[PDB]
């Protein structure tokens, strides 16, 4: 079990952090919760 689990492509944790930051900043424009959407196009009005 653990023998095969050990053999895995190991990447830097900083690389994972950078990837997460890139993903967060890539789709930040399409976040209605992040930026307050005005009532004009908000379907909750």
């Amino acid at each position: 079990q653990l023998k095969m689990e050990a053999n895995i492509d190991r990447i830097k944790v900083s690389k994972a952090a950078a990837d997460l930051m890139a993903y967060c900043e890539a789709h930040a424009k399409e976040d209605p919760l992040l930026t307050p959407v005005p009532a004009s196009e908000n379907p909750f009005r």
């Binding site: 190991r10 944790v13 952090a17 967060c24 399409e30 209605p32 919760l33 992040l34 307050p36």
Partner: protein
């Protein structure tokens, strides 16, 4: 020895934390949200809620034996499915919206069909193979469904056949929460052992181990990228674990909170995540800065469940007052 080797490897791989990278990132600031819709149809406590694929219909289960499918626009009721067992602890919504699932203290994740020629909701399937109270059964496709039990096991079920195909074992404490990846190729489960197991559906065996909590974990949610998920515990210290790094990254803790957490969820882009504590307040934690950016109120007793729409248009939260609040 192998556990020590894994611990040493992860410690060596821990060269820097996300805080240093996110230090230069400006904070999201104050996030002001108000209850724009109020759904009051239930009469007892509710413990589950799941949004639809079209970000219009959502399903919620209550303890009065009734399940209500609400319209997020007109606040109307489209269906009302009575439950044979009044004790329901979880619910799920099919990706295509053709089927619904419900599970609780009874060892059954019943499947209900919504669209039929007769036009009347009726029981579709009754999966009864578990020996413990169910925690969370979630749909993978229109043909497959996973189940989380209260007897240290998780099994994959085929709807038409009714017999489980794969069974997972290895937990000491009962599993509480289960979340599915966006691609429906793998999932991670959590148990009261202060640890989480990653499970692969196609092969059907565990892959990797997470630890770090001191008490039981109540909720788990996958990051939108699908390479990480956040775990909540009763110690009021949510921990985010990355499937790539395979190690703890940051902790969401505050001295002002002493009560545990019930449900967690992420946003469409994953920049901000929601958290439902036992203080009838939901905290809008920032994914990067790990700070508190928003406060939600309006619940009397406790927040039980909350979920974000696929489109990210709004977020819904459930409490023990039979009131569903739609925040945006």
């Amino acid at each position: 020895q192998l556990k020590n080797q894994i611990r040493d490897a992860r410690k060596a791989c821990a060269d820097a934390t996300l805080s240093q990278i996110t230090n230069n990132i400006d904070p999201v600031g104050r996030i002001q949200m108000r209850t724009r819709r109020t759904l009051r149809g239930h009469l007892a406590k509710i413990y589950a809620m799941h949004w639809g694929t079209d970000s219009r219909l959502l399903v919620s289960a209550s303890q009065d034996g009734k399940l209500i499918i609400w319209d997020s626009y007109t606040t109307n009721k489209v269906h009302a499915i009575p439950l044979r067992s009044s004790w329901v602890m979880t619910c799920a919504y099919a990706p295509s919206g053709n089927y619904v699932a419900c599970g609780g203290l009874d060892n059954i994740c019943s499947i209900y069909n919504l669209k039929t020629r007769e036009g009347n909701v009726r029981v579709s399937r009754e999966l009864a193979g578990h020996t413990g109270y169910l925690s969370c059964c979630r749909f993978l496709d229109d043909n497959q469904i996973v189940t989380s039990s209260g007897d240290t096991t998780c099994a994959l079920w085929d709807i038409e056949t009714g017999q489980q195909t794969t069974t997972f074992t290895g937990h000491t404490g009962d599993v509480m929460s289960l979340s599915l990846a966006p691609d429906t190729r793998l999932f991670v489960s959590g148990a009261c052992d202060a640890s989480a197991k990653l499970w692969d559906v196609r092969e059907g065996m565990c892959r990797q181990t997470f630890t770090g909590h001191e008490s039981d974990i109540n909720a788990i949610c996958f990051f939108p990228n699908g390479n990480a998920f956040a775990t909540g515990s009763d110690d009021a210290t949510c921990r985010l674990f990355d499937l790539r790094a395979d190690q703890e990254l940051m902790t969401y803790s505050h001295d002002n909170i002493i009560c545990g957490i019930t449900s967690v969820s992420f946003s469409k882009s994953g920049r901000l995540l929601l958290a439902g504590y036992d203080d009838f307040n939901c905290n809008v934690w920032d994914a990067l800065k790990a700070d508190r950016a928003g406060v939600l109120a309006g619940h009397d007793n406790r927040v039980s469940c909350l979920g974000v729409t696929d489109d990210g248009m709004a977020v819904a939260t459930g409490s023990w007052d039979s009131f569903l609040k739609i925040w945006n």
